[PDB]
Amino acid sequence: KKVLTLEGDLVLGGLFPVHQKGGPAEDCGPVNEHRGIQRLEAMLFALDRINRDPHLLPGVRLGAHILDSCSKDTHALEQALDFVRASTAITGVIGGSYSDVSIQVANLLRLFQIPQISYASTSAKLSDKSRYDYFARTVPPDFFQAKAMAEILRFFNWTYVSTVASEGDYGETGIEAFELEARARNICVATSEKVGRAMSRAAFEGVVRALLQKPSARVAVLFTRSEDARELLAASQRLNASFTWVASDGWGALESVVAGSEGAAEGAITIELASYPISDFASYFQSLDPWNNSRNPWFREFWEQRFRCSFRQRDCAAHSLRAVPFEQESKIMFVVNAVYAMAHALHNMHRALCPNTTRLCDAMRPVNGRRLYKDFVLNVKFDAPFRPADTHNEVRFDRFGDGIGRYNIFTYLRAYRYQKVGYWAEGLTLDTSLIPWASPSAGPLPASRCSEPCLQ
Amino acid sequence: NSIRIDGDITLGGLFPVHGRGSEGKPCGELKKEKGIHRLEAMLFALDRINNDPDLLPNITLGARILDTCSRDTHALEQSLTFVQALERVVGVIGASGSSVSIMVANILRLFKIPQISYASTAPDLSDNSRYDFFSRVVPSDTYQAQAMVDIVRALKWNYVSTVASEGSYGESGVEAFIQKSREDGGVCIAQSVKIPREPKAGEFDKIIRRLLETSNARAVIIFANEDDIRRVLEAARRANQTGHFFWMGSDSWGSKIAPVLHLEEVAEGAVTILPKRMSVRGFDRYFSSRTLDNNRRNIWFAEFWEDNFHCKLYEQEGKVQFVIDAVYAMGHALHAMHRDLCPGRVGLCPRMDPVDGTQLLKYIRNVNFSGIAGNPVTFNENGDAPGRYDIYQYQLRAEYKVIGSWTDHLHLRIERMHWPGSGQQLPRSICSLPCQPGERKKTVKGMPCCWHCEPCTGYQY
């Protein structure tokens, strides 16, 4: 319904999963706290900093046209039609979040050469530039996660493992890439279950029974479903069946999937993108006042949801984001970097064909998408915004519009919180002394093999 | 370039008259029987429905025919012209390519343009939550997978190999086949291999090598486009496998002449399943008696003359009767809508100028017009045709022939010259032979359709 539109002057559109996927009804669900509102406020903060920046587009103020995808590709297309209805002319559409939404929106936008920098689209299918010639990406492909996941399963000698996927690109490509890697490393895939886009609650327990049909495979590797943050919320079931989950980019460093369901007990291994929390965004978000923040339409519903008070009634404005604890979402960087990348691309174009004046001379304003993406967005090269002083991280793109592959491996832990076990960067490193599994204190290290080893 | 047939209310089509390009080429070579026969089929159905005053009185159907190149992205870029007006197109005859149909329904739904698609049997389109405006005049491929599993059981084969083209036909048809094999299908998958969208460096030769590794898995059940059929069978010929494998062809194979022309040695005995068809005599006479390359109404006609005779400027395809069924369906639906919105007013009444997909979709769904050759045409809630199939075998001495029919009944005819070209009495693929003397456990592995024979040697008998 509502759309977030800032001032003009070469606005950058944005796709965010601000609302959860609804049920069978043709409506959206609740507000997505971490995976949703936080990323939107991060991109708004990045735009505010870019406008404040005396160097990045000094004479151009970057607006925004933010859409809600509701985690449904169909609704994503029905909303993203507003991007192409301009032919105000949207310069580019940042995001797409879940990779199926990103694929649908990129397929729609390639007809209008709108550059799309996605902050979380991971599925390898978007690596093909023959079909997505106007797509850029700040995250590594999920093929690399099938690497890291295989390495992990080879480190614990988990030769027997069961794969669960969801219909759509992420699940399909994830299980295909992991099955390829498992056959490459002698790892056997016991079973391959899939969940449909809005399959029933009871069928998830059916899938768990199918998982239990192979008792040897205690380790059930999870490919994110659509997103573990809210689909595995319905498949981390505690019907007295436990596993050692191994989970892809859809599960990690968020409590939305583990709240109230300890069947995914402490020790479940998850993989998240390697990132750091940007310091100033914490202050910006915690200081943010619902009645002063008239910009964001969904923020008032988010603060109706987090604190059950409805702003139409009292018992609101008493709490604040400073009093309650705040943990920065892992991909927040991958959002802000994306925004900055686009900004820098635009600035480079302003350095190229508009150096004689402060702002646009009206010949570039009908921005040509093809030259913009091929010459400027794909060629961006600058250090990341708001780094820790030590690192030299930069957000250059690959030859085919992708980022660098680096992951942090977490485990869920009790005394309940996540805990970074190690990192994968062209090679696995696990400091197992940091997890309960090393120095086995609950029986031996968890085993998953098709048959037991035998004597001489 | 589109055909752009002018009319009061203009239709559209997504016929793949050109094949897929390679090495970045925007488009490939003309597909002849696959494309042209279908395109002209519509261009005959519309012509006859404009000539007949009993349907759409004094209303002429236009046609913005455009090639999809059998490539999904080019299909989207060409279909953009239908919805360029954010001259309106009333309905789009969807493309034979299942993935093309999927994406075009993913886009035409936004602008409320109903689709009636010949072919495009992929079961993924059955989901009305995403493709509500999509509809089919052919049975879904789920029934085809079930019919194939039944045919395999009836042939008493086991340990089948399967080959699938990348996309939404192969992977989503072979998945339904594997599922209905596990679901008490009595057959177990020997080896599944995916043909990529862009095969490189003679990939089909390594496809054949892979399939020969499971040499016992002699039955290869195949879900791939006719180019992939042509190249996998040519690769099998190059490996001197002629008479080894028995092919089981999905409806992408059907009775098409291009998979088998100049290639009869390996294709003999290839049992295939097609939706039930009748050869429409009127279209045959119209296309045969056409003084073609002389009347040049459509564009791509000269390429057909140049390629069918190899000079500078037959049997009809299987799906064309579904093409003309689809067109007739469109017309009939429009007729009904007219008679329900402006009765008695001949010609294009004002209510038929802002024709909208939402209202026309119901008339498309519930239309019933008994078809051009007496086959009933109806749509269920999801918009799929009833599942009935004919069962063919490629028997030499282009010589396809009926060997049975499948509609919930498995009505085969083994005595109807069913031998797959070698041996006698339907030679079988089987993973392990029976052991009559008796086996210590006849021990099955985890896959239950095959066993190792350890004999009752010694006192343990």
Side-chain angles (χ1 to χ4, degrees), chain B residues 61-119:
Chain B
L61 291 178
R64 252 190 177 276
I65 309 184
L66 48 88
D67 171 48
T68 58
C69 197
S70 186
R71 179 167 294 271
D72 189 20
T73 305
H74 171 273
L76 175 60
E77 196 158 334
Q78 212 67 26
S79 317
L80 173 62
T81 64
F82 289 145
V83 300
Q84 192 52 73
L86 295 167
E87 299 83 10
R88 219 185 310 113
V89 73
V90 47
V92 177
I93 311 305
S96 86
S98 295
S99 57
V100 172
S101 295
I102 288 186
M103 176 178 73
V104 78
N106 263 324
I107 266 66
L108 286 174
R109 166 180 43 88
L110 318 177
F111 303 106
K112 323 299 266 300
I113 300 307
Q115 272 208 301
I116 294 181
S117 174
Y118 55 95

Coordinates of all heavy atoms in Angstrom, one line a residue, chain B residues 61-119:
Chain B
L61 N -10.6 -10.6 -35.7 CA -9.5 -10.8 -34.7 C -8.1 -10.4 -35.4 O -7.8 -11.0 -36.4 CB -9.4 -12.2 -34.2 CG -10.6 -12.6 -33.3 CD1 -10.5 -14.1 -32.9 CD2 -10.7 -11.7 -32.1
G62 N -7.4 -9.5 -34.8 CA -6.1 -9.1 -35.2 C -5.0 -10.1 -34.6 O -5.4 -11.0 -33.8
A63 N -3.8 -9.9 -35.0 CA -2.7 -10.8 -34.6 C -1.4 -10.0 -34.6 O -0.9 -9.7 -35.7 CB -2.7 -12.0 -35.4
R64 N -0.8 -9.8 -33.5 CA 0.6 -9.3 -33.4 C 1.5 -10.5 -33.1 O 2.1 -10.6 -32.0 CB 0.7 -8.2 -32.3 CG 0.9 -6.8 -33.0 CD 1.3 -5.8 -31.9 NE 1.6 -4.5 -32.6 CZ 2.7 -4.2 -33.1 NH1 3.8 -5.0 -33.1 NH2 2.9 -3.0 -33.7
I65 N 1.7 -11.3 -34.1 CA 2.5 -12.5 -33.9 C 4.0 -12.1 -33.8 O 4.5 -11.3 -34.6 CB 2.4 -13.4 -35.2 CG1 0.9 -13.7 -35.5 CG2 3.1 -14.7 -35.0 CD1 0.8 -14.6 -36.7
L66 N 4.7 -12.7 -32.8 CA 6.1 -12.3 -32.6 C 6.8 -13.6 -32.2 O 6.3 -14.4 -31.4 CB 6.2 -11.2 -31.6 CG 5.5 -11.3 -30.3 CD1 6.3 -12.1 -29.2 CD2 5.2 -9.9 -29.8
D67 N 8.0 -13.7 -32.7 CA 8.8 -14.9 -32.4 C 9.4 -14.8 -31.0 O 9.8 -13.8 -30.6 CB 10.0 -15.0 -33.5 CG 11.0 -16.1 -33.1 OD1 10.5 -17.2 -32.8 OD2 12.2 -15.8 -33.1
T68 N 9.4 -16.0 -30.3 CA 10.1 -16.0 -29.0 C 11.5 -16.5 -29.1 O 12.2 -16.5 -28.1 CB 9.3 -16.9 -28.1 OG1 9.2 -18.2 -28.6 CG2 7.9 -16.4 -27.8
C69 N 11.9 -17.0 -30.3 CA 13.3 -17.5 -30.5 C 13.6 -18.7 -29.6 O 14.7 -19.2 -29.6 CB 14.4 -16.5 -30.4 SG 16.0 -16.9 -31.1
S70 N 12.6 -19.3 -29.0 CA 12.7 -20.4 -28.0 C 13.7 -20.0 -26.9 O 14.2 -20.9 -26.2 CB 13.2 -21.7 -28.7 OG 13.2 -22.8 -27.8
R71 N 14.0 -18.7 -26.8 CA 14.9 -18.2 -25.7 C 14.1 -17.3 -24.8 O 13.3 -16.4 -25.2 CB 16.1 -17.4 -26.3 CG 17.0 -16.8 -25.3 CD 18.3 -16.4 -25.9 NE 19.1 -17.5 -26.5 CZ 19.9 -18.2 -25.8 NH1 20.2 -17.9 -24.5 NH2 20.6 -19.2 -26.4
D72 N 14.3 -17.5 -23.5 CA 13.4 -16.9 -22.5 C 13.5 -15.4 -22.4 O 12.5 -14.7 -22.4 CB 13.7 -17.6 -21.1 CG 12.6 -17.2 -20.1 OD1 11.5 -16.8 -20.4 OD2 12.9 -17.3 -18.9
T73 N 14.7 -14.9 -22.4 CA 15.0 -13.5 -22.3 C 14.5 -12.8 -23.6 O 13.8 -11.7 -23.5 CB 16.5 -13.2 -22.1 OG1 16.9 -13.9 -20.9 CG2 16.7 -11.7 -21.8
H74 N 14.8 -13.3 -24.7 CA 14.3 -12.7 -26.0 C 12.8 -12.8 -26.1 O 12.2 -11.9 -26.6 CB 15.0 -13.4 -27.2 CG 14.4 -13.0 -28.5 ND1 13.3 -13.6 -29.0 CD2 14.7 -12.0 -29.4 CE1 13.0 -13.0 -30.2 NE2 13.8 -12.1 -30.4
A75 N 12.2 -13.8 -25.5 CA 10.8 -13.9 -25.5 C 10.2 -12.8 -24.6 O 9.2 -12.2 -25.0 CB 10.4 -15.3 -24.9
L76 N 10.8 -12.6 -23.5 CA 10.3 -11.4 -22.6 C 10.4 -10.1 -23.4 O 9.5 -9.3 -23.4 CB 11.0 -11.4 -21.3 CG 10.7 -10.2 -20.4 CD1 9.3 -10.2 -20.0 CD2 11.6 -10.3 -19.2
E77 N 11.6 -9.9 -24.0 CA 11.8 -8.6 -24.7 C 10.8 -8.4 -25.8 O 10.4 -7.3 -26.1 CB 13.3 -8.5 -25.1 CG 13.7 -7.1 -25.5 CD 15.2 -7.0 -25.4 OE1 15.9 -7.7 -24.7 OE2 15.7 -6.1 -26.1
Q78 N 10.5 -9.5 -26.5 CA 9.5 -9.4 -27.6 C 8.1 -9.3 -27.1 O 7.3 -8.6 -27.7 CB 9.7 -10.6 -28.6 CG 9.4 -10.2 -30.0 CD 10.4 -9.3 -30.6 OE1 11.5 -9.2 -30.2 NE2 10.0 -8.5 -31.6
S79 N 7.8 -9.9 -26.0 CA 6.4 -9.9 -25.4 C 6.2 -8.5 -24.8 O 5.0 -8.2 -24.5 CB 6.2 -11.0 -24.4 OG 6.8 -12.2 -24.9
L80 N 7.2 -7.7 -24.5 CA 7.0 -6.4 -24.0 C 6.2 -5.5 -24.9 O 5.4 -4.7 -24.4 CB 8.4 -5.7 -23.7 CG 8.4 -4.2 -23.3 CD1 7.7 -4.0 -22.0 CD2 9.8 -3.7 -23.3
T81 N 6.2 -5.8 -26.2 CA 5.4 -5.0 -27.1 C 3.9 -5.2 -26.9 O 3.1 -4.3 -27.2 CB 5.7 -5.4 -28.6 OG1 5.4 -6.8 -28.8 CG2 7.2 -5.2 -28.8
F82 N 3.5 -6.4 -26.3 CA 2.1 -6.6 -26.0 C 1.6 -5.6 -25.0 O 0.5 -5.0 -25.1 CB 1.8 -8.0 -25.5 CG 2.0 -9.0 -26.6 CD1 2.5 -10.3 -26.3 CD2 1.5 -8.8 -27.9 CE1 2.6 -11.3 -27.3 CE2 1.7 -9.8 -28.9 CZ 2.2 -11.0 -28.5
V83 N 2.4 -5.3 -24.0 CA 2.0 -4.4 -22.9 C 2.7 -3.1 -22.9 O 2.9 -2.4 -21.9 CB 2.2 -5.1 -21.5 CG1 1.3 -6.4 -21.4 CG2 3.6 -5.4 -21.3
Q84 N 3.2 -2.7 -24.1 CA 3.8 -1.4 -24.3 C 2.9 -0.3 -23.9 O 3.3 0.7 -23.4 CB 4.3 -1.2 -25.7 CG 5.2 0.0 -25.9 CD 6.4 0.0 -24.9 OE1 7.3 -0.8 -25.0 NE2 6.3 0.9 -24.0
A85 N 1.6 -0.4 -24.2 CA 0.6 0.5 -23.7 C 0.3 0.1 -22.3 O -0.5 -0.9 -22.0 CB -0.7 0.4 -24.6
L86 N 0.8 0.9 -21.3 CA 0.8 0.5 -19.9 C -0.7 0.5 -19.4 O -1.4 1.5 -19.4 CB 1.6 1.5 -19.1 CG 3.1 1.5 -19.3 CD1 3.8 2.7 -18.7 CD2 3.7 0.2 -18.8
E87 N -5.6 -0.7 -29.8 CA -4.2 -1.2 -30.0 C -3.9 -2.2 -28.9 O -2.9 -2.9 -28.9 CB -3.2 -0.1 -29.9 CG -3.4 0.9 -31.1 CD -4.4 2.0 -30.7 OE1 -4.8 2.1 -29.6 OE2 -4.7 2.8 -31.6
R88 N -4.8 -2.3 -27.9 CA -4.6 -3.2 -26.7 C -4.8 -4.7 -27.2 O -5.6 -5.0 -28.1 CB -5.7 -2.9 -25.7 CG -5.1 -3.1 -24.2 CD -6.2 -2.9 -23.2 NE -7.0 -1.7 -23.4 CZ -8.3 -1.7 -23.8 NH1 -8.9 -2.9 -24.0 NH2 -9.0 -0.6 -24.0
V89 N -3.9 -5.5 -26.7 CA -4.0 -7.0 -27.0 C -5.0 -7.6 -26.0 O -5.0 -7.3 -24.8 CB -2.6 -7.6 -27.0 CG1 -2.1 -7.7 -25.5 CG2 -2.7 -9.0 -27.6
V90 N -5.8 -8.5 -26.4 CA -6.9 -9.1 -25.6 C -6.4 -10.4 -25.0 O -6.6 -10.6 -23.8 CB -8.2 -9.3 -26.4 CG1 -7.8 -9.9 -27.7 CG2 -9.2 -10.1 -25.6
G91 N -5.7 -11.2 -25.7 CA -5.2 -12.5 -25.2 C -4.0 -12.9 -26.0 O -3.8 -12.6 -27.1
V92 N -3.1 -13.6 -25.2 CA -1.8 -14.0 -25.8 C -1.8 -15.6 -25.8 O -2.0 -16.2 -24.8 CB -0.6 -13.5 -25.0 CG1 0.7 -14.1 -25.5 CG2 -0.6 -12.0 -25.0
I93 N -1.7 -16.1 -27.0 CA -1.5 -17.6 -27.1 C 0.0 -17.9 -26.7 O 0.9 -17.6 -27.4 CB -1.7 -18.0 -28.6 CG1 -3.1 -17.5 -29.1 CG2 -1.7 -19.5 -28.7 CD1 -4.2 -17.8 -28.2
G94 N 0.1 -18.5 -25.5 CA 1.4 -18.6 -24.9 C 2.3 -19.5 -25.7 O 1.9 -20.2 -26.7
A95 N 3.6 -19.5 -25.3 CA 4.6 -20.2 -26.1 C 4.7 -21.7 -25.7 O 4.3 -22.1 -24.6 CB 6.0 -19.5 -25.8
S96 N 5.2 -22.5 -26.7 CA 5.4 -23.9 -26.5 C 6.4 -24.2 -25.4 O 6.2 -25.1 -24.6 CB 5.8 -24.6 -27.8 OG 7.2 -24.5 -28.0
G97 N 7.4 -23.4 -25.3 CA 8.4 -23.5 -24.3 C 7.8 -23.3 -22.9 O 7.2 -22.2 -22.7
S98 N 8.0 -24.2 -22.0 CA 7.4 -24.1 -20.7 C 8.0 -23.0 -19.9 O 7.2 -22.2 -19.2 CB 7.6 -25.4 -20.0 OG 6.9 -26.5 -20.6
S99 N 9.3 -22.8 -19.9 CA 9.9 -21.7 -19.2 C 9.5 -20.3 -19.7 O 9.2 -19.4 -19.0 CB 11.4 -21.8 -19.2 OG 11.9 -21.9 -20.5
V100 N 9.4 -20.2 -21.1 CA 8.9 -19.0 -21.7 C 7.5 -18.7 -21.2 O 7.2 -17.6 -20.9 CB 9.0 -19.1 -23.2 CG1 8.3 -18.0 -23.9 CG2 10.5 -19.2 -23.7
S101 N 6.6 -19.7 -21.2 CA 5.3 -19.6 -20.8 C 5.2 -19.1 -19.3 O 4.5 -18.3 -18.9 CB 4.5 -20.9 -21.0 OG 4.3 -21.2 -22.3
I102 N 6.1 -19.7 -18.5 CA 6.2 -19.3 -17.1 C 6.5 -17.9 -16.9 O 5.8 -17.1 -16.2 CB 7.2 -20.2 -16.3 CG1 6.7 -21.6 -16.2 CG2 7.5 -19.6 -15.0 CD1 7.6 -22.5 -15.4
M103 N 7.5 -17.4 -17.6 CA 7.9 -16.0 -17.4 C 6.9 -15.0 -18.0 O 6.6 -14.0 -17.5 CB 9.3 -15.8 -18.0 CG 9.9 -14.4 -18.0 SD 11.6 -14.2 -18.7 CE 11.4 -14.4 -20.5
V104 N 6.4 -15.4 -19.2 CA 5.4 -14.5 -19.8 C 4.1 -14.5 -19.0 O 3.4 -13.4 -19.0 CB 5.2 -14.9 -21.3 CG1 4.2 -16.1 -21.4 CG2 4.6 -13.8 -22.1
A105 N 3.8 -15.5 -18.3 CA 2.6 -15.4 -17.4 C 3.0 -14.7 -16.1 O 2.1 -14.0 -15.5 CB 2.1 -16.8 -17.0
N106 N 4.3 -14.7 -15.7 CA 4.7 -13.9 -14.6 C 4.7 -12.4 -14.9 O 4.7 -11.6 -13.9 CB 6.2 -14.4 -14.2 CG 6.2 -15.4 -13.0 OD1 5.3 -15.3 -12.1 ND2 7.1 -16.3 -13.1
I107 N 4.7 -12.1 -16.1 CA 4.7 -10.7 -16.5 C 3.3 -10.2 -17.0 O 2.9 -9.1 -16.6 CB 5.8 -10.4 -17.6 CG1 7.1 -9.9 -17.0 CG2 5.3 -9.4 -18.6 CD1 7.8 -11.0 -16.1
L108 N 2.7 -11.0 -17.8 CA 1.3 -10.6 -18.3 C 0.3 -10.6 -17.2 O -0.7 -9.9 -17.4 CB 0.9 -11.6 -19.4 CG 1.6 -11.5 -20.8 CD1 1.2 -12.6 -21.7 CD2 1.3 -10.1 -21.4
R109 N 0.5 -11.3 -16.1 CA -0.4 -11.2 -15.0 C -0.4 -9.8 -14.4 O -1.5 -9.3 -14.0 CB 0.0 -12.2 -13.9 CG -0.7 -11.9 -12.5 CD -0.2 -13.0 -11.5 NE 1.2 -13.2 -11.6 CZ 2.1 -12.5 -10.9 NH1 1.8 -11.5 -10.1 NH2 3.4 -12.8 -11.0
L110 N 0.7 -9.1 -14.4 CA 0.7 -7.7 -13.9 C -0.2 -6.8 -14.7 O -0.8 -5.9 -14.1 CB 2.2 -7.2 -13.9 CG 3.3 -8.2 -13.5 CD1 4.7 -7.5 -13.6 CD2 3.1 -8.6 -12.0
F111 N -0.3 -7.0 -16.0 CA -1.1 -6.2 -16.8 C -2.4 -6.8 -17.2 O -3.2 -6.3 -18.0 CB -0.3 -5.8 -18.1 CG 1.0 -5.1 -17.9 CD1 2.2 -5.8 -18.0 CD2 1.0 -3.8 -17.4 CE1 3.4 -5.2 -17.8 CE2 2.2 -3.2 -17.2 CZ 3.4 -3.9 -17.4
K112 N -2.8 -7.9 -16.5 CA -4.1 -8.6 -16.7 C -4.4 -9.0 -18.1 O -5.4 -8.6 -18.7 CB -5.2 -7.7 -16.1 CG -4.8 -7.0 -14.8 CD -4.4 -7.9 -13.7 CE -5.6 -8.2 -12.8 NZ -6.2 -7.0 -12.2
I113 N -3.4 -9.7 -18.7 CA -3.6 -10.2 -20.1 C -3.7 -11.7 -20.0 O -2.7 -12.4 -19.7 CB -2.4 -9.8 -21.0 CG1 -2.3 -8.3 -21.0 CG2 -2.6 -10.4 -22.4 CD1 -3.6 -7.6 -21.5
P114 N -4.9 -12.3 -20.3 CA -5.1 -13.8 -20.1 C -4.3 -14.5 -21.2 O -4.0 -14.0 -22.3 CB -6.6 -14.0 -20.4 CG -7.2 -12.6 -20.3 CD -6.1 -11.6 -20.7
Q115 N -3.9 -15.7 -20.8 CA -3.1 -16.6 -21.7 C -3.7 -17.9 -21.8 O -4.2 -18.6 -20.9 CB -1.7 -16.8 -21.1 CG -0.7 -15.7 -21.5 CD 0.7 -16.2 -21.5 OE1 1.3 -16.7 -20.5 NE2 1.4 -16.2 -22.7
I116 N -3.8 -18.4 -23.1 CA -4.2 -19.8 -23.4 C -3.0 -20.3 -24.2 O -2.8 -19.9 -25.4 CB -5.5 -19.8 -24.2 CG1 -6.7 -19.4 -23.3 CG2 -5.8 -21.3 -24.7 CD1 -8.0 -19.5 -24.0
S117 N -2.3 -21.3 -23.7 CA -1.1 -21.8 -24.2 C -1.2 -23.2 -24.7 O -1.6 -24.1 -23.9 CB 0.1 -21.7 -23.2 OG 1.2 -22.3 -23.7
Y118 N -1.0 -23.4 -26.0 CA -0.7 -24.8 -26.4 C 0.6 -25.3 -25.8 O 1.5 -24.5 -25.4 CB -0.5 -24.8 -28.0 CG 0.5 -23.8 -28.5 CD1 1.8 -24.3 -28.7 CD2 0.2 -22.5 -28.7 CE1 2.8 -23.4 -29.1 CE2 1.2 -21.6 -29.1 CZ 2.5 -22.1 -29.3 OH 3.4 -21.2 -29.8
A119 N 0.8 -26.6 -25.7 CA 1.9 -27.2 -25.1 C 2.2 -26.6 -23.7 O 1.3 -26.3 -23.0 CB 3.2 -27.0 -26.0

